Design an enzyme around this catalytic site. Structure first.
Site, short mmCIF file in Angstrom:
data_model
loop_
_atom_site.label_atom_id
_atom_site.label_comp_id
_atom_site.label_asym_id
_atom_site.label_seq_id
_atom_site.Cartn_x
_atom_site.Cartn_y
_atom_site.Cartn_z
N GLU A 98 25.72 -98.35 -10.05
CA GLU A 98 26.04 -96.99 -9.60
C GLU A 98 27.56 -96.76 -9.54
O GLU A 98 28.06 -95.73 -10.00
CB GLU A 98 25.43 -96.72 -8.22
CG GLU A 98 23.91 -96.53 -8.21
CD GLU A 98 23.45 -95.38 -9.09
OE1 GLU A 98 23.96 -94.25 -8.92
OE2 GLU A 98 22.57 -95.59 -9.95
N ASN A 124 29.82 -94.57 -12.17
CA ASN A 124 30.63 -93.52 -11.57
C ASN A 124 32.08 -93.63 -12.05
O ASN A 124 32.70 -92.63 -12.40
CB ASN A 124 30.54 -93.58 -10.05
CG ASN A 124 29.40 -92.73 -9.50
OD1 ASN A 124 29.18 -92.69 -8.30
ND2 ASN A 124 28.67 -92.05 -10.38
N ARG A 170 22.51 -85.21 -13.72
CA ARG A 170 23.11 -86.18 -12.81
C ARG A 170 22.29 -86.45 -11.55
O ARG A 170 22.13 -85.57 -10.71
CB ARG A 170 24.50 -85.72 -12.42
CG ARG A 170 25.52 -85.74 -13.55
CD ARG A 170 26.00 -87.15 -13.82
NE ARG A 170 25.11 -87.86 -14.72
CZ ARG A 170 24.56 -89.04 -14.45
NH1 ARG A 170 24.81 -89.64 -13.29
NH2 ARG A 170 23.77 -89.60 -15.35
N1 LIG Z 1 35.15 -93.17 -9.69
C1 LIG Z 1 35.10 -91.81 -9.54
N2 LIG Z 1 36.08 -91.03 -10.10
C2 LIG Z 1 36.04 -89.72 -9.95
N3 LIG Z 1 35.10 -89.01 -9.28
C3 LIG Z 1 34.13 -89.78 -8.72
C4 LIG Z 1 34.05 -91.14 -8.79
N4 LIG Z 1 32.92 -91.56 -8.09
C5 LIG Z 1 32.39 -90.49 -7.64
N5 LIG Z 1 33.06 -89.40 -7.97
C6 LIG Z 1 32.72 -87.95 -7.60
O1 LIG Z 1 31.59 -87.96 -6.70
C7 LIG Z 1 30.46 -87.18 -7.23
C8 LIG Z 1 29.21 -87.82 -6.72
O2 LIG Z 1 28.92 -89.13 -7.27
P1 LIG Z 1 27.40 -89.67 -7.13
O3 LIG Z 1 26.92 -89.48 -5.76
O4 LIG Z 1 27.34 -91.03 -7.76
O5 LIG Z 1 26.64 -88.68 -8.16
P2 LIG Z 1 26.77 -88.54 -9.70
O6 LIG Z 1 26.90 -89.94 -10.28
O7 LIG Z 1 25.38 -87.94 -9.99
O8 LIG Z 1 27.84 -87.62 -10.05
C9 LIG Z 1 30.72 -87.19 -8.71
O9 LIG Z 1 30.12 -86.03 -9.32
C10 LIG Z 1 32.29 -87.14 -8.83
O10 LIG Z 1 32.78 -85.77 -8.78
MG LIG Z 2 26.78 -91.90 -9.72
#
Ligand SMILES: Nc1ncnc2c1ncn2[C@@H]1O[C@H](COP(=O)(O)OP(=O)(O)O)[C@@H](O)[C@H]1O
Ligand SMILES: [Mg+2]
Ligand SMILES: Nc1ncnc2c1ncn2[C@@H]1O[C@H](COP(=O)(O)OP(=O)(O)O)[C@@H](O)[C@H]1O
Ligand SMILES: [Mg+2]
EC number: 2.7.11.1
Lengths: 141, 57, 141
Positions: free
Chosen positions: C46, C50, C105
């Site tokens: 995860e 991300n 997503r």
């Molecule tokens: N490493 C990262 N760099 C930039 N934005 C991130 C990162 N991790 C998370 N995010 C932000 O947090 C949001 C939520 O992440 P998550 O809960 O994993 O859902 P998803 O993977 O469906 O987008 C992402 O849409 C992004 O905008």
């Molecule tokens: Mg994610």
């Protein structure tokens, strides 16, 4: 393609299987055969084992460093340590030769490496450390 | 069962690989690929590599 | 015991499996339940995904950096990226929230992290990058 990976772990011994898994799992991308892999994990166990015991005379703080760069079907492995180093290269790289003939495995190592991999280039300089190349092209059918 | 120790669980899948290897070798008519074995087992090529290690020890 | 590992690799979708297997192999030394090793293995996927799909917006030149520290029944995982950064942490962490909704997503993610791990801490700065902590205390009977 062009995929690169870099790994660093303490020079303990319990990190042997770990180095193997990591390198193999990464080279697995090239879609090899269960054998080509088992060879790679061996080539790795050899170099990584050397570093651990020779380079750092089994000092759990030695920190071993691995580098793998898959590209256009050719694995580009690299194991290096900032340890003791190797005085004579061609000599320490001769079959059956050892410094710690305390058996426990062999006298072979650069032989295995030399064997399995297509190319093996070593590099050392007392107290600086050793940097073994190791390369193995992988084919398809 | 959750508390599958991982040692036992990983070792069991390891054997299945030995088997899947010769099965595909016959089925394909040459050494099988990590991927092919992965697919034959409903597992990823990485998990094949991981499980394999457990079987050697 | 105090065992530590440090991994870096191209920010490629393909290195997600590689990453979890590697972490798993290492955290394996703790002899966890297939159940625990799975959660750990899920969280890594995860966080790396991300980092790849958000932090580097899928740019291969990204370089995800992983770090694991095993020390007395506890796993210390750290996923870091010199990427885009998270505008608002609290918002990004609420379930179902995503920046790429129109890209199928799994609203979940941070939510998955929070459930499987004992602690999840996020440090991020726009145009600087992101770092997710993640701590897992592995059971001993
Ligand atoms: N490493 C990262 N760099 C930039 N934005 C991130 C990162 N991790 C998370 N995010 C932000 O947090 C949001 C939520 O992440 P998550 O809960 O994993 O859902 P998803 O993977 O469906 O987008 C992402 O849409 C992004 O905008
Ligand atoms: Mg994610
Ligand atoms: N990483 C290293 N650091 C220092 N010396 C090394 C290293 N690798 C190899 N050597 C030298 O080469 C010799 C032969 O190594 P090898 O063929 O693997 O056999 P062995 O593992 O039984 O020593 C070693 O005994 C050592 O003197
Ligand atoms: Mg040796």
């Amino acid at each position: 393609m062009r995929n690169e990976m870099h790994l660093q772990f303490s020079a303990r011994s319990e990190n042997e299987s770990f180095a193997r898994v990591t390198v193999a799992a990464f080279v697995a991308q090239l879609d090899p055969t269960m054998d080509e892999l088992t060879e790679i994990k061996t080539v790795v166990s050899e170099a990584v084992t050397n570093a651990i015991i020779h380079g750092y005379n089994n000092d759990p703080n030695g920190i071993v460093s691995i580098s793998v760069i898959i590209e256009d079907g050719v694995v580009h492995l690299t194991v290096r340590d900032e340890g003791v180093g190797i005085p004579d290269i061609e000599e320490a790289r001769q079959p059956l030769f050892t410094t710690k003939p305390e058996l426990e495995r062999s006298g072979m190592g650069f032989t295995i490496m030399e064997n399995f991999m297509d190319e093996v280039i070593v590099e050392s300089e007392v107290n600086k450390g050793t940097t073994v190349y190791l390369k193995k092209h992988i084919v398809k059918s | 069962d959750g508390t599958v120790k991982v040692s036992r669980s990983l070792k069991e899948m390891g054997n299945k690989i030995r088997k899947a290897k010769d099965e595909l070798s016959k089925t394909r008519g040459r050494a099988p690929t990590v991927t092919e074995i992965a697919d034959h087992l409903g597992i990823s090529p990485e998990d094949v590599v991981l499980a394999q290690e457990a079987v050697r020890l």
